[PDB]
Structure 1
Amino acid sequence: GMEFNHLTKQLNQLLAQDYVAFSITENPVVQMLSQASFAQIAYVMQQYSIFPKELVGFTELARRKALGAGWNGVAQELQENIDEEMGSTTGGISHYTLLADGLEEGLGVAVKNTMPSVATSKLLRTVLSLFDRQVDYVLGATYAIEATSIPELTLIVKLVEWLHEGAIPKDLQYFFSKHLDAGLRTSVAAYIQPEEFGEFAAGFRAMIDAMQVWWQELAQEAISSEVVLS
C-alpha cells in the first residue's frame, strides 16, 4: 500500500543520491579507468562475475525465509526470480553463463573457476550474515539486489565496452539489452506490517553498504597489482 510504496521509493532514492558505487561517473572502478590497464579491469570483471552466481543462492535463502514466515506470495515471486536467473527466459542458459561465456568469447577473459579475492570473500561472508536475519530484514536486503540491478548492469556495460576493442558478442549484447532497454515490491506489500518497515530499511541499507564497500575494495585490489612495495 501507500506507506510501503513510500518506503521503497525512499530506498531507491537513497541509493541514487548517496552511493558512489552505483554512480556511472563516481564508481571507484570508473574513477580509475584513466590509469588502469586491461589486465586490471579484467580482474575486476572476473571478481564481479562471482556475485551474480552467488546471488541465486542468497535469493534461495530469502525464499526460505519468506516461506517460513508464511509470506507465500513473496516466496513465489522469489522462485520466479531464481528460475529466470537460472535460464527460464533465456533458453535454459543462466544469466551467469551468458556473462561468463560473453567475456570469454569477446575478450579471452576466463572467469569460470575464479576464486573470490579477499574483498569478494569478505563481501560474501557479510552478505550471508544479512540473509540469516528475520524475514523483514532479509527481504530488505533482497530488495536492495533488485534496486541495484539496473545501476549495476549500466556500470558493467561500461566496463565491458571499455575492455572490448570492437563489438561485444551478440548474446552478451542481448543479456544487456533485456535488462537495460514491481513484482517483488507488490508481493512484499501484501505481508509486511508497518512495525517492521524499519527492519526492511535496515536490511536494504546493510546490503547496499556491503556492496559499496566491495566495489571500493575491489578497485584497490585491482590497482595494487602494479604497486612497488615501499
Structure 2
Amino acid sequence: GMEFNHLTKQLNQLLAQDYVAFSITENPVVQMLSQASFAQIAYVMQQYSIFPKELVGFTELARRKALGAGWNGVAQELQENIDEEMGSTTGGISHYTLLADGLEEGLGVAVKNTMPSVATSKLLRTVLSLFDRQVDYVLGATYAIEATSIPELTLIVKLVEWLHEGAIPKDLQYFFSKHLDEWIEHEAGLRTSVAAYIQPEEFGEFAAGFRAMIDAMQVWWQELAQEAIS
C-alpha cells in the first residue's frame, strides 16, 4: 500500500542516485571498455552468466522463507517467477539456456562450462548468507534483484553491442525484447504481494536486506573489472 510504496520508492531512488555499478555510463566495466580486448569482455559475460544460472535457486530459498512466515501471496508470486525463469512462457526453455545459447551461437562466447572467479564466488557466498536471515530482510534482498533487473539488462546490451560491432544477433534480440518490455508487471506483482503482509516495524529489515544486496552486487562489478581488465 501507500506506506510500502513510499519505502520502495526511496530504495529505488537510492539505487538510481548512489550506485555507479548500475549506471550505463559509470559502471566500472563500461568505464574500462576502451582498454579491453574481446577476450577480456567475453570473460566478463561468462562470469556474469553465473548469476542468471543460480537465480532460480535463490528465488526458491526466498519462496521457502515466505512459506515459513505464512506470506502465502508472496510464495505464490515467487513461484510464478520461478516458472517463467524455467520456461513457462517459452515452451520449457529456461531464460539461462536462452541467454547461454544466444551468446554462444550469436557471439562465439561459450558460458555453460564457466567456473566462478574469486569475485563471483564472493558474491555467491554473500548472497547465500543474506538468504539465511528473516523473511523481511530476505524479501528486501529479493526486491533488489527485481529493482536492478532493467539496469543490469541495459548494461548487458551495451556489452553485447561492443562484442558484436554495434548489432544484436537474432536470438539475443528476442531475449532482450521480451524482458525490457513490461517487466513493471514483475516489479508490481512482488511489491503488492509483500505489501499484503509486511508491517511498518519491519521496514528497517527490508531496507537493510535491499542495501546488502546492491552493495554485494556493486562490489562484484568493481572486482570483476579489476580481474578482467587490470
Bin of the TM-score, shorter chain as denominator length:
over 0.9
Once residues 10 and 171 of structure 1 are traced to their aligned partners in structure 2, the CA distance between those partners, rounded to angstroms, is: 36
2:184 aligned partner: none
> Aligned equivalents of 2:24 and 2:168: distance in 1?
19
Deviation per CA, 1:67-116, whole angstroms, max 9, x where unpaired? Answer: 00000000000001101111111221111111100110112111001000
Q: TM-score, normalised by structure 2?
A: 0.95
Among all aligned residue pairs of Structure 1 and Structure 2, give the percentage whose two residues are the same amino acid. 100
Q: Which moved more, 1:44-53 or 1:158-167?
A: 158-167
CA distance in structure 2 between the partners assigned to 1:218 and 1:138 by the alignment: 25
Closer, same or farther: CA 211–166 of 1 in aligned 2, 3 Å: closer
| TM superposition score normalised by structure 1 | 0.95
CA distance in 2, matches of 1:56, 1:19: 25
For the Cα contact (< 8 Å) 2:41–2:163, is it kept in 1? Answer: yes
Aligned-residue Cα RMSD (Å) equals: 1.2
- Distance apart, 1:180 and its partner CA: 1.3
Q: How does 1:41-120 map to 2 (within 5 A)?
A: 41-120=41-120
Query: Cα offset for 1:166?
Result: 6.4
**Residue deviations 1:171-212 (CA, integer Å, cap 9, x gap):** 210110111130000000000011100000000000000000
Provide the C-alpha distance between the structure 2 equivalents of 1:91 and 1:158, rounded to a whole number of angstroms. Answer: 28
Q: Which runs of 5+ in 2 are unaligned?
A: 182-187
SS in 2 for 1:34: helix
Whole-angstrom distance in 2 between the partners of 1:47 and 1:62: 23
Q: How many residues align?
A: 224
The C-alpha deviation readout for 1:44-85, integer Å capped at 9, x for no partner, is 000000001111101000000000000000000000110111
Distance in 2, matches of 1:135 and 1:194, equals: 14
Give structure 1 stretches of 5+ with no counterpart: 224-229
After TM superposition, list the pairs within 5 Å mapping 1:13-28 onto structure 2.
13-28=13-28
